[PDB]
Amino acid sequence: STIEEQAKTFLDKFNHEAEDLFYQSSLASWNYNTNITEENVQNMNNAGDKWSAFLKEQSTLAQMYPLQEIQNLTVKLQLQALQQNGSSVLSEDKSKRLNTILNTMSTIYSTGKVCNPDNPQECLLLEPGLNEIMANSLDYNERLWAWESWRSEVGKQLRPLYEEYVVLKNEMARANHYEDYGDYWRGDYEVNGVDGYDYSRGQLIEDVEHTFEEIKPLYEHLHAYVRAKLMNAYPSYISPIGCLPAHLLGDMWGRFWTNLYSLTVPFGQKPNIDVTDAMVDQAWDAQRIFKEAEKFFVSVGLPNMTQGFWENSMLTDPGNVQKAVCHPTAWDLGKGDFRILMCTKVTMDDFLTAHHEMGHIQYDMAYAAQPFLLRNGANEGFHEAVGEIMSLSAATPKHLKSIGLLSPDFQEDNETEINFLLKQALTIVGTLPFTYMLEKWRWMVFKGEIPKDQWMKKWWEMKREIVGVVEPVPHDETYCDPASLFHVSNDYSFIRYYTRTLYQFQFQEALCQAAKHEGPLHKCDISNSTEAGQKLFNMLRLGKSEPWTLALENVVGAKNMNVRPLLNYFEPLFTWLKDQNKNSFVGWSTDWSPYA
Amino acid sequence: NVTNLCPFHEVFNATRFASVYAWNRTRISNCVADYSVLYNFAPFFAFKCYGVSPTKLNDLCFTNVYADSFVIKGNEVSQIAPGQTGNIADYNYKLPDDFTGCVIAWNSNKLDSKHSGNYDYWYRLFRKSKLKPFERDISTEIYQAGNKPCKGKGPNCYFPLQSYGFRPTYGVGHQPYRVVVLSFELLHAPATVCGPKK
Numbered sequence: 001s002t003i004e005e006q007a008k009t010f011l012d013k014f015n016h017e018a019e020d021l022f023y024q025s026s027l028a029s030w031n032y033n034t035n036i037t038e039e040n041v042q043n044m045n046n047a048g049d050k051w052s053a054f055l056k057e058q059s060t061l062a063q064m065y066p067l068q069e070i071q072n073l074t075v076k077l078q079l080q081a082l083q084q085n086g087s088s089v090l091s092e093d094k095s096k097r098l099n100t101i102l103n104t105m106s107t108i109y110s111t112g113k114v115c116n117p118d119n120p121q122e123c124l125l126l127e128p129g130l131n132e133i134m135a136n137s138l139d140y141n142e143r144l145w146a147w148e149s150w151r152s153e154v155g156k157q158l159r160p161l162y163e164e165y166v167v168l169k170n171e172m173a174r175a176n177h178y179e180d181y182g183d184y185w186r187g188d189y190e191v192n193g194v195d196g197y198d199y200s201r202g203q204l205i206e207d208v209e210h211t212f213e214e215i216k217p218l219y220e221h222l223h224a225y226v227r228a229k230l231m232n233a234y235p236s237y238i239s240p241i242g243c244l245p246a247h248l249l250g251d252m253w254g255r256f257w258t259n260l261y262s263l264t265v266p267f268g269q270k271p272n273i274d275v276t277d278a279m280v281d282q283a284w285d286a287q288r289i290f291k292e293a294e295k296f297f298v299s300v301g302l303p304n305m306t307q308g309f310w311e312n313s314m315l316t317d318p319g320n321v322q323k324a325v326c327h328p329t330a331w332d333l334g335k336g337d338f339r340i341l342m343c344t345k346v347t348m349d350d351f352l353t354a355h356h357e358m359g360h361i362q363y364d365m366a367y368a369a370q371p372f373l374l375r376n377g378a379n380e381g382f383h384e385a386v387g388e389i390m391s392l393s394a395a396t397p398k399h400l401k402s403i404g405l406l407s408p409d410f411q412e413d414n415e416t417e418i419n420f421l422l423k424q425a426l427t428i429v430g431t432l433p434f435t436y437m438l439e440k441w442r443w444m445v446f447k448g449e450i451p452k453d454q455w456m457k458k459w460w461e462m463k464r465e466i467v468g469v470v471e472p473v474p475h476d477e478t479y480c481d482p483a484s485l486f487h488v489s490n491d492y493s494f495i496r497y498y499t500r501t502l503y504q505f506q507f508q509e510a511l512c513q514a515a516k517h518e519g520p521l522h523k524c525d526i527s528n529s530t531e532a533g534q535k536l537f538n539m540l541r542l543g544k545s546e547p548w549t550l551a552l553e554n555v556v557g558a559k560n561m562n563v564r565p566l567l568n569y570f571e572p573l574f575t576w577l578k579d580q581n582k583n584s585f586v587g588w589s590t591d592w593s594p595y596a
Numbered sequence: 597n598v599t600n601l602c603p604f605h606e607v608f609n610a611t612r613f614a615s616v617y618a619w620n621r622t623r624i625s626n627c628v629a630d631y632s633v634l635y636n637f638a639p640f641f642a643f644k645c646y647g648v649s650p651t652k653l654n655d656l657c658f659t660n661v662y663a664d665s666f667v668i669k670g671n672e673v674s675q676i677a678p679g680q681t682g683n684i685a686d687y688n689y690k691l692p693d694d695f696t697g698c699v700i701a702w703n704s705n706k707l708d709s710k711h712s713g714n715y716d717y718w719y720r721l722f723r724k725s726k727l728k729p730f731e732r733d734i735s736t737e738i739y740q741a742g743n744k745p746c747k748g749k750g751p752n753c754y755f756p757l758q759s760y761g762f763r764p765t766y767g768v769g770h771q772p773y774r775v776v777v778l779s780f781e782l783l784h785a786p787a788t789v790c791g792p793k794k
């Protein structure tokens with residue numbers, strides 16, 4: 001027997017054991033998340049330990065068959081996944097140190113809190129009070145105080161842990177083959193062995209640079225408009241040619257600009273298209289919303305939910321003593337089991353969220369035929385974009401009119417479209433520079449270009465140079481601002497959002513072109529169309545069996561990332577902004593500072 | 597030719613139903629085979645008949661009847677048919693291409709699944725070759741997927757059998773199913789097994 005046959009037999013045995021082990025672990029996790037107690041935590045920990053141990057031994061056995069004697073190109077992917085996602089290289093003491101450091105950082109982030117200086121006995125946590133204060137309150141002093149207090153009480157503690165963490169991660173990454181941890185993160189987009197579809201780990205940086213260079217002008221126009229409106233709002237802090245202080249962006253960090261809509265609306269008099277009152281009047285509930293989402297998904301040809309989905313999933317918060325986490329998530333326990341966990345109220349936002357989660361569940365359902373190691377999205381960005389396109393398509397006025405929530409006596413003038421486009425832009429376009437700058441800074445930090453004594457200096461310099469945001473209070477090397485973010489402190493990658501932002505718009509334009517639709521792209525619906533559903537399914541069913549370049553070429557016809565769809569989506573808003581900005585200066589200067 | 601009734605109600609309606617790799621075999625002879633005893637079970641997942649018609653079955657008379665019973669998954673029931681390939685078809689139970697009989701299958705999730713998982717149903721996974729029609733192989737020897745001679749369970753040596761994990765929360769296509777196969781034939785005989793008639 002050759003190597004390939006033995007590899008196939010080993011893969012069969014591994015799949016047939018891993019399915020059951022994964023099902024048990026996922027069931028334990030769900031049982032904990034729904035019925036929070038202590039014995040549920042014990043069971044979840046036991047299941048996780050069993051799964052991790054099994055993966056470890058399976059990787060150790062799988063490290064025997066060489067990878068250069070296999071030409072099937074499908075066994076190789078699974079063998080590489082096993083060999084890379086369960087291997088341990090560092091010694092036991094270093095592994096224990098890394099795990100302890102990660103647990104300490106997570107606990108510090110989770111249990112961190114601040115107290116009122118006026119009343120030390122009064123303290124408030126981040127999520128309940130600090131987020132609300134940063135969101136809705138309008139007062140310079142309190143926002144500045146909250147921002148400074150959180151930064152000083154989090155980053156100062158987390159700095160030495162990060163300093164010790166980067167060295168261990170660099171050693172672990174350099175151990176296998178990679179230069180550093182940045183290469184380890186960037187290796188997700190690598191494609192090897194296929195002629196005409198190859199992708200190197202160094203191509204991603206150049207692609208990101210090119211896309212951001214093509215994006216910049218629209219972002220700077222939006223920034224100028226927002227700066228002018230904020231100057232109209234705050235009369236003694238914002239400069240006409242300066243930069244926006246960081247503590248006036250509507251949230252703790254500045255990731256999203258959504259909370260500035262109530263202050264920068266182009267036309268206040270014209271109302272929005274909120275349909276909460278109609279839903280209340282028509283006596284709706286969670287069941288009706290989910291049935292409507294199911295009907296919408298059926299109308300495009302995709303299959304609808306199984307009986308187990310309705311039997312097992314919970315859609316409303318039990319309240320009383322049954323504690324639970326109300327974060328909406330989509331579960332895939334395997335063995336044909338699919339559930340959605342969320343606490344649903346009567347709001348249009350819940351309508352859109354239900355559509356998004358049902359889209360994620362459909363994506364999970366599509367590829368449930370590939371081997372156990374290939375049941376995943378083509379890369380880290382496809383799944384999110386597939387989720388987001390449904391929410392994009394389900395918010396159009398035409399869909400609401402067809403459903404019945406919106407009265408047929410509604411008209412769409414210039415101003416309604418302008419308001420809708422601006423509201424979408426404030427959330428979509430305002431987050432790209434932040435993500436790009438954060439990922440770039442982390443890449444340089446891991447590569448070693450930035451020394452340990454210039455962290456904050458380079459961070460704020462790049463913030464000013466890219467995001468156009470200036471700090472309100474100077475920071476020395478004792479602070480660690482990036483550690484205050486959940487993703488940075490909990491060891492998660494961050495470029496997936498940047499990729500999904502482009503992917504969702506490319507997919508949406510391709511789908512709308514396949515449905516023979518005329519007019520502006522921002523008014524597009526694919527509810528009745530069946531060609532779009534079949535075309536989407538043709539890519540959904542693939543899973544990980546093909547490189548993402550091939551799937552992208554199959555869907556949109558382009559092998560690489562493109563930014564033209566995103567620019568075409570915002571064209572009327574871009575023209576309006578260009579016409580509006582004929583007086584105020586466009587651009588920013590980094591020499592200014594709020595603290596003289 | 598006054599006789600008694602056949603034990604159809606006993607091959608059906610049993611607590612333990614035997615695993616697929618060790619399927620049971622019962623011979624029916626010298627009785628009146630009424631076919632109204634069935635249809636009292638759940639709506640069948642499959643009632644395919646090959647040599648005769650399900651309606652043209654009460655008045656007909658046979659020579660001898662064989663009943664085979666086992667438990668399989670949901671998506672594997674399509675592999676029990678003349679001339680089919682797959683793991684179950686060629687490693688556990690193979691049917692001849694000139695089969696004359698009927699195949700009955702119905703969902704039994706409410707009786708063959710437990711919260712902690714049912715591990716009492718097995719199915720062979722590895723074998724050296726295929727299976728001849730209507731053949732059985734009940735043995736346990738370590739598979740040799742390698743060149744070095746095998747001694748015990750270890751690298752490149754596997755335990756031939758494997759068990760299911762039936763649970764009540766599994767989706768359709770993974771829940772247990774009960775399968776019963778009847779194989780009739782009409783040949784030189786005094787026609788012992790006749791349908792109910794007067």
Ligand SMILES: *[C@@H]1O[C@H](CO)[C@@H](O[C@@H]2O[C@H](CO)[C@@H](O[C@@H]3O[C@H](CO[C@H]4O[C@H](CO)[C@@H](O)[C@H](O)[C@@H]4O)[C@@H](O)[C@H](O[C@H]4O[C@H](CO)[C@@H](O)[C@H](O)[C@@H]4O)[C@@H]3O)[C@H](O)[C@H]2NC(C)=O)[C@H](O)[C@H]1NC(C)=O
Pocket residue numbers: 081085327328329330331360373376384387491492493
């Ligand atoms: C190889 O090994 C790696 C790491 O061991 C595995 O990578 C993990 O992959 C999973 C899924 O692919 C990742 O899970 C994702 O986590 C995101 C981060 O969420 C965290 O924060 C939220 C709070 O904001 C918590 O509630 C949550 O529990 C996490 O702590 C999620 O945001 C993602 O959810 C998205 O998708 C789901 C549906 O899948 C939607 O319902 C959500 O709304 C959202 O859109 C997702 O769950 C995980 O982060 C990865 N790990 C790391 C370290 O990056 C590989 O899976 C593994 N490969 C194998 C085994 O083949």
Ligand SMILES: *[C@@H]1O[C@H](CO)[C@@H](O[C@@H]2O[C@H](CO)[C@@H](O[C@@H]3O[C@H](CO)[C@@H](O)[C@H](O)[C@@H]3O)[C@H](O)[C@H]2NC(C)=O)[C@H](O)[C@H]1NC(C)=O
Pocket residue numbers: 008071072073074075681682
């Ligand atoms: C690389 O290896 C894979 C794994 O063996 C090969 O995929 C296999 O392809 C064959 C057909 O070419 C599949 O056989 C099919 O079996 C079903 C019954 O399950 C039958 O109905 C079909 O008619 C067909 O005979 C086989 O299932 C499939 N393997 C898996 C795990 O699904 C692949 O062809 C190999 N490619 C190269 C280039 O070597």
Ligand SMILES: *[C@@H]1O[C@H](CO)[C@@H](O[C@@H]2O[C@H](CO)[C@@H](O)[C@H](O)[C@H]2NC(C)=O)[C@H](O)[C@H]1NC(C)=O
Pocket residue numbers: 299398399402403525527528
């Ligand atoms: C998809 O097709 C269905 C079936 O016709 C549409 O449902 C109809 O919508 C019109 C809109 O004015 C109503 O008057 C009908 O009463 C609806 N029929 C039924 C049976 O409900 C649906 O509107 C189409 N999708 C879109 C987005 O228009």
Ligand SMILES: *[C@@H]1O[C@H](CO)[C@@H](O)[C@H](O)[C@H]1NC(C)=O
Pocket residue numbers: 035037039322
């Ligand atoms: C939750 O856990 C408790 C503790 O074992 C258990 O008694 C209860 O049945 C579980 N389910 C619910 C709905 O409370």
Ligand SMILES: *[C@@H]1O[C@H](CO)[C@@H](O)[C@H](O)[C@H]1NC(C)=O
Pocket residue numbers: 298302303304
């Ligand atoms: C959607 O669910 C209904 C049951 O309400 C079912 O009749 C229908 O067949 C399902 N859709 C498809 C495409 O099967």
Ligand SMILES: *[C@@H]1O[C@H](CO)[C@@H](O)[C@H](O)[C@H]1NC(C)=O
Pocket residue numbers: 413414
């Ligand atoms: C609104 O759109 C119509 C469409 O032709 C156009 O004629 C009109 O000038 C627009 N108004 C403004 C203020 O842009």
Ligand SMILES: *[C@@H]1O[C@H](CO)[C@@H](O)[C@H](O)[C@H]1NC(C)=O
Pocket residue numbers: 605609610
């Ligand atoms: C037939 O099935 C019924 C259903 O509960 C059962 O009560 C009865 O004992 C069965 N007959 C047997 C096992 O002979």
Ligand SMILES: *[C@@H]1O[C@H](CO)[C@@H](O)[C@H](O)[C@H]1NC(C)=O
Pocket residue numbers: 610612613614620621622
């Ligand atoms: C197999 O059939 C025989 C027929 O008499 C029966 O006695 C036996 O109990 C059956 N096996 C099982 C496991 O029920």
